[PDB]
Design an enzyme around this catalytic site. Structure first.
Site, mmCIF file in Angstrom:
data_model
loop_
_atom_site.group_PDB
_atom_site.id
_atom_site.type_symbol
_atom_site.label_atom_id
_atom_site.label_comp_id
_atom_site.label_asym_id
_atom_site.label_seq_id
_atom_site.Cartn_x
_atom_site.Cartn_y
_atom_site.Cartn_z
ATOM 1 N N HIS A 83 21.096 32.553 50.238
ATOM 2 C CA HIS A 83 19.980 31.724 49.807
ATOM 3 C C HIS A 83 18.791 32.117 50.682
ATOM 4 C CE1 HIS A 83 21.544 28.906 52.985
ATOM 5 N NE2 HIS A 83 20.320 28.418 53.028
ATOM 6 N N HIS A 85 16.853 30.682 53.041
ATOM 7 C CA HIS A 85 16.534 30.195 54.381
ATOM 8 C C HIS A 85 16.704 31.289 55.443
ATOM 9 C CE1 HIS A 85 17.327 25.748 53.215
ATOM 10 N NE2 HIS A 85 16.110 26.150 52.902
ATOM 11 N N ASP A 87 18.403 31.624 58.103
ATOM 12 C CA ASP A 87 19.719 32.034 58.585
ATOM 13 C C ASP A 87 20.438 32.954 57.599
ATOM 14 O OD1 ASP A 87 19.964 29.864 56.781
ATOM 15 O OD2 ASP A 87 21.790 29.115 57.802
ATOM 16 N N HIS A 148 22.991 22.940 48.238
ATOM 17 C CA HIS A 148 22.175 22.985 49.456
ATOM 18 C C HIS A 148 20.770 23.495 49.155
ATOM 19 C CE1 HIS A 148 21.102 24.003 53.650
ATOM 20 N NE2 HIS A 148 20.749 25.187 53.185
ATOM 21 N N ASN A 179 20.297 20.021 56.936
ATOM 22 C CA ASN A 179 18.990 20.254 56.334
ATOM 23 C C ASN A 179 19.121 20.165 54.823
ATOM 24 O OD1 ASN A 179 16.487 21.172 55.474
ATOM 25 N ND2 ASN A 179 16.669 23.170 56.484
#
Ligand SMILES: C[C@H](CS)C(=O)N[C@H](Cc1coc2ccccc12)B(O)O
Ligand SMILES: [Zn+2]
Ligand SMILES: [Zn+2]
Length: 231
Positions: A83, A85, A87, A148, A179
């Protein structure tokens, strides 16, 4: 024993062998004074490696490549970010500079651009609808639906029955939502159900952050998400 956030200095990366030709990579970052671990996956693809997700930042991802070269010694030829983000894509530019072909869904590439994050080069087709799966080298990529994030992918290694849930799946020790600013809380339980339906034989389930387990992690995540929904 799986490495713990207390055992990894930021800037360092550990590899953990899950099954023959399958490792996770574990790195750490500091945020608001705390230290958080993050997982990705490495899958052997003949005489090459497929990487799943960066090690959360340029410096960590450079250390990841150095640790792979030292411990495994096969080339990382492709990388998939699950995804948008940091990380998952933070470190894409380091991978690209090193000659790794970087991949993400067009949804992930768009959201990374909007966020000002690093953007994988190549676009993965065939993952645009909930329930879509495609084969990518030694793994299957699955879009379970929004959870998420609206773009989150999961990864299955059929040879080893390893399910990598990414940040759509919580470790057992996480009792409250993390988050969720980009989450679809309303769809997340249904998306988890799609994962369970598609990979009921999974023997190892790897969350985006923290300790692996079994398929219990899916119902665990649903419980936490629903509790947060009702907060
Ligand atoms: C980076 C990663 C993307 S899924 C993430 O957001 N992790 C959560 C902690 C966190 C929130 O906001 C941050 C900002 C920077 C670093 C960490 C964080 B969690 O695990 O509780
Ligand atoms: Zn995330
Ligand atoms: Zn994450």
């Amino acid at each position: 024993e799986y490495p713990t956030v207390s055992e990894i200095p930021v800037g360092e990366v550990r590899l953990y062998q899950i099954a023959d030709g399958v490792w996770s990579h574990i790195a750490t970052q500091s945020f608001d004074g705390a230290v958080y671990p993050s997982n990705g996956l490495i899958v052997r693809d003949g005489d090459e490696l497929l990487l799943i997700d960066t090690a959360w930042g340029a410096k960590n991802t450079a250390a990841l490549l150095a640790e792979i070269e030292k411990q495994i010694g096969l080339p990382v030829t492709r990388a998939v970010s699950t995804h948008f983000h940091d990380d998952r894509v933070g470190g894409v530019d380091v991978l690209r500079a090193a000659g790794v072909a970087t991949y993400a869904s067009p949804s992930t590439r768009r959201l990374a651009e909007v966020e000002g994050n690093e953007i994988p080069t190549h676009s993965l087709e065939g993952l645009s609808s909930s329930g879509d799966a495609v084969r990518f080298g030694p793994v299957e990529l699955f879009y379970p639906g929004a959870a998420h994030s609206t773009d989150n992918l999961v990864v299955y290694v059929p040879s080893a029955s390893v399910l990598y849930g990414g940040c759509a799946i919580y470790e057992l020790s996480r009792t409250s939502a993390g988050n969720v600013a980009d989450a679809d809380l309303a769809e997340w339980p249904t998306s988890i159900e799609r994962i369970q339906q598609h990979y009921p034989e999974a023997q190892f389930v790897i969350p985006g952050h923290g300790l692996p387990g079994g398929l219990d992690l899916l119902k665990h995540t649903t419980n936490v998400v629903k509790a947060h929904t009702n907060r």
